[PDB]
Design a protein around this nucleic acid. Structure first.
Length: 471
DNA sequence: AAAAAGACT
DNA sequence: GGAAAAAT
């Protein structure tokens, strides 16, 4: 089936009709058998089916760098004084006096017990967990049925937040049928609520891409259940994401000359604007919005950058005007680059960190809003992220034009694809139509690069790219 | 105008 | 996307 050849639904409504089967929770918590333990301060303590539940989550992560983490322990003591009784929490004054050891041989033996299940016992219940995929896994829509990406609801556990996240090790409780909000049309066969329980609400909102959604008890953010990346609704948005990058190509020349001029400006917020835009163009940086200090980890993007984050050198490693970026981005991954800049920029940068304490911001009169509000005036649909998608793709066009040998053989061209793929992260940002434009200009089978799963997401690109598709 | 809340690499 | 479980 092809959706790119059919008529496109304009801005507003995201689906004409929708009827989904509903979600799937974690099969009601299975209790601990008689033989398992819990040794406390010399003696032994007993556990309630609520505290016994939370117990199994710390068992599932004993020899992890998380247990030897101070903040993680601090939050497990707090969130645990809630998940038990008053008599149980009466004696307990230190976690250091606990032993999860008997549950640790158990958890480990339980992992190896599936490695003991036969070439028939591994299909007895393994076919049953696939009976779900057929029932609750697909959902009807406008044309045909689309596959749902994550029908199985987030099972309760702990928070595996990155780096030095202040809310790691908190009770991420079990989602009950009453926290759920179902979304589908008011002329459809609505999902029957699990025996005895109600839903939170039901909305017939056709302006959204989601089917089901609940709220996270930890941070207060809403988590959704959407479709498979194969879908019209999940694909047309990525098609549009690349189409947005296409409409940029010509207007780029003007943007660079535009901000390059804004360097020798007369005002604060204006001179500030341009510098940032230079980094997001060159460095391939992210924006970094207003973060909640005390809610999340201390990461920084471009707008959220601080004084302490940049070190500036006039002459370094034979190069003039160098800026040394030292910070932790998304997923707490440290970004380090000794990047050489232009004269005017270095000079502009100097002027910011001019009587300022290290703990304060770098970009005084500037945030993401002012950045994106500017970018919108310049073009329709243009946002800070578009640069990461533009730069990364236009490279591949110029790379996939010279690195391929004409009178070459088999892999002497695929050795050039990975060479261009090395020229920087793979999965996103790159336009599949450039990769497919090259596969017909020269003639390389798609099954060799992209597997069955990947040939599912780029399905639109396969059927709409020829031997001369220039970006 | 700014904050919060919603949604969709 | 990243981590981690599952497919001689």
């Amino acid at each position: 089936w092809k959706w790119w050849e059919e008529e496109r639904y304009p801005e507003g409504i995201k689906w004409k009709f929708l009827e989904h089967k509903g979600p799937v929770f974690a099969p009601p918590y299975e209790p601990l058998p008689e033989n398992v333990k819990f040794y406390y301060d010399g003696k032994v303590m007993k556990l309630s089916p609520k505290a016994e539940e939370v117990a199994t989550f710390f068992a599932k992560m004993l020899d992890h760098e998380y247990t030897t983490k101070e903040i993680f322990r601090k939050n497990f003591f707090k969130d645990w004084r809630k998940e038990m009784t008053n008599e149980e929490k009466n004696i307990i004054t230190n976690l250091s006096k606990c032993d999860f050891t008997q549950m640790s041989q158990y958890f480990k033996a339980q992992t190896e017990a599936r490695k003991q299940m036969s070439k028939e016992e591994k299909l007895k219940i393994k076919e049953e967990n696939e009976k779900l995929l057929k029932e609750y896994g697909f959902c009807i829509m406008d044309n045909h049925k689309e596959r749902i990406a994550n029908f199985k609801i987030e099972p309760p556990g702990l928070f595996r937040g990155r780096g030095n996240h202040p809310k790691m090790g908190m009770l991420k409780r079990r989602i009950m049928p009453e926290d759920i909000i179902i979304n589908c049309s008011k002329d459809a066969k609505v999902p029957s609520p699990p025996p005895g329980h109600k839903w939170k609400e039901v909305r017939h909102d056709n302006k959204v891409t989601w089917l089901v959604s609940w709220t996270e008890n930890i941070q207060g953010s809403i988590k959704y259940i959407m479709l498979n990346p194969s879908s019209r609704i999940k694909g047309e948005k990525d098609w549009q994401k690349y189409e947005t990058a296409r409409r940029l190509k010509k207007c780029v020349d003007k943007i660079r000359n535009q901000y390059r001029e804004d360097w020798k400006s007369k005002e604060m917020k204006v001179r500030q604007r341009a510098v940032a835009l230079y980094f997001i163009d060159k460095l391939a940086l992210r924006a970094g919005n207003e973060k909640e200090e005390g809610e999340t980890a201390d990461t920084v993007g471009c707008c959220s950058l601080r004084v302490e984050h940049i070190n500036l050198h006039p002459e370094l490693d034979g190069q003039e005007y160098v800026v040394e970026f030292d910070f932790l981005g998304k997923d707490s991954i440290r970004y380090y680059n000794k990047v050489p800049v232009e004269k005017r920029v270095f000079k502009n940068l100097q002027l910011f960190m001019e009587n300022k304490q290290p703990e304060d911001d770098l970009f005084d009169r500037l945030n993401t809003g002012i950045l994106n509000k500017h970018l919108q005036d310049l073009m329709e649909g243009l946002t800070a992220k578009v640069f990461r998608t533009y730069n990364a793709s236009i490279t591949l066009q110029q790379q996939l034009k010279e690195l391929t040998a004409p009178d070459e053989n088999i892999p002497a061209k695929i050795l050039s694809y990975n060479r261009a793929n090395r020229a920087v992260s793979k999965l996103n940002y790159l336009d599949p139509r450039i990769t497919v434009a090259w596969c017909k200009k020269w003639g390389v089978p798609i099954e060799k690069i992209y597997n069955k799963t990947q040939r599912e997401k780029f399905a639109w690109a396969i059927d709409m790219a020829d031997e001369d598709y220039e970006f």
